[PDB]
Amino acid sequence: MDIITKMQVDVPRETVFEAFVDPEKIGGFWFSSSSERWEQGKTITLRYEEYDAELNINIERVEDNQLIAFTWGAHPITIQFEESEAGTVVTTTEKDFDTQDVKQLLGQKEGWVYMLSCLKVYLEHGVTIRAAILL
Amino acid sequence: MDIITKMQVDVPRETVFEAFVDPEKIGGFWFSSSSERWEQGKTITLRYEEYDALNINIERVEDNQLIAFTWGAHPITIQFEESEAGTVVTTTEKDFDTQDVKQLLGQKEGWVYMLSCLKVYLEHGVTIRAAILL
Numbered sequence: 227m228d229i230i231t232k233m234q235v236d237v238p239r240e241t242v243f244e245a246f247v248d249p250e251k252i253g254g255f256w257f258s259s260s261s262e263r264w265e266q267g268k269t270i271t272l273r274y275e276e277y278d279a280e281l282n283i284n285i286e287r288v289e290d291n292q293l294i295a296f297t298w299g300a301h302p303i304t305i306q307f308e309e310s311e312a313g314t315v316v317t318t319t320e321k322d323f324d325t326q327d328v329k330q331l332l333g334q335k336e337g338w339v340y341m342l343s344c345l346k347v348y349l350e351h352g353v354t355i356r357a358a359i360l361l
Numbered sequence: 362m363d364i365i366t367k368m369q370v371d372v373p374r375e376t377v378f379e380a381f382v383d384p385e386k387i388g389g390f391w392f393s394s395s396s397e398r399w400e401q402g403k404t405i406t407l408r409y410e411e412y413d414a415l416n417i418n419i420e421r422v423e424d425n426q427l428i429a430f431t432w433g434a435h436p437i438t439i440q441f442e443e444s445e446a447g448t449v450v451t452t453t454e455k456d457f458d459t460q461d462v463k464q465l466l467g468q469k470e471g472w473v474y475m476l477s478c479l480k481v482y483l484e485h486g487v488t489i490r491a492a493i494l495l
Contacts, residue, residue, distance in 0.1 A: 231470065325459075331462060331465075332465065332466070332469050335470060335473075339470050339477070340473055340477060343477030347477075347481045351487045353485045355480045356480075
C-alpha cells in the first residue's frame with residue numbers, strides 16, 4: 227500500500243516548490259521552522275513549535291521545482307510537482323503499508339490531505355489554517 | 362467500519378452550524394447551494410455547479426449540535442461541540458467494509474478536505490475549490 231494524495235494549487239510550480247524548501251515559507255502550512263533550505267544530501271532539522279518537538283530528516287533526492295524525496299519511519303516519501311492549467315498539482319506519496327492496519331492508513335491519509343489543504347490556502351490566499359504535523 | 366473525522370474551527374458552534382444549513386452559506390465550502398434550509402423531515406436538493414449536478418432526506422437536526430442524513434447505504438452524522446477556541450466538528454460516515462481500502466481512503470480524503478474548506482471559509486472569509494464528496 228502506497229498512500230498517494232494529489233492537490234491542485236493555483237500558483238506556478240516554482241512557487242509551490244519554494245513553499246516547502248524555503249525555511250521561511252514552510253511555517254505557513256507545515257513545520258513551524260526548518261534548519262536550512264532543502265537540498266539533495268542535507269540533513270534538516272524540522273521543528274514543531276506546537277508540540278515543542280523536533281525531528282531530523284535527510285533529503286535523499288531533489289529535482290528543482292519537481293521533486294523532493296526522503297524517508298520517515300522507514301517509509302519512502304516523495305513530493306512531486308507537475309504543471310496544470312490553473313497552476314500546479316502536488317502529489318505526495320508515502321510508500322509501503324499493509325492492509326491489516328486500516329486505522330494507520332486512514333490517519334496518515336488524513337495528515338497528507340490536511341497538510342496539502344493548508345498548503346493550498348497559504349499559497350492561494352496568504353492566510354493560514356493551523357499548520358499540521360503529519361510526521 | 363465508520364470513517365470519523367474531527368476538525369477544530371475557531372468560531373462559535375452556532376456559526377459553524379449555520380454554515381451547513383443556510384442555503385446561502387454552504388457554497389463557501391461544500392455544495393454550491395441547497396433548495397432550502399436544512400430542517401428535520403425535509404428533502405433537500407443540493408447543487409454542485411462545477412459538475413452542473415442530488416437529493417438527501419434530513420433525518421435529524423438538533424440545532425447547533427447535530428445533523429443526520431443517509432447517502433447511499435451509508436448513514437452520516439455531522440456534530441458540533443464547543444471547544445475553548447471555537448468548535449470541534451465531527452463527521453461520521455458509517456458502515457463500510459474493510460475490503461475496499463481505496464474506498465475508505467477516498468472517502469476519508471473527502472471529509473478531511475471538506476472540513477479544511479470549512480475552516481478557511483469561516484476563519485478567513487476566503488475559499489478554496491469546493492468538492493462534491495457525495
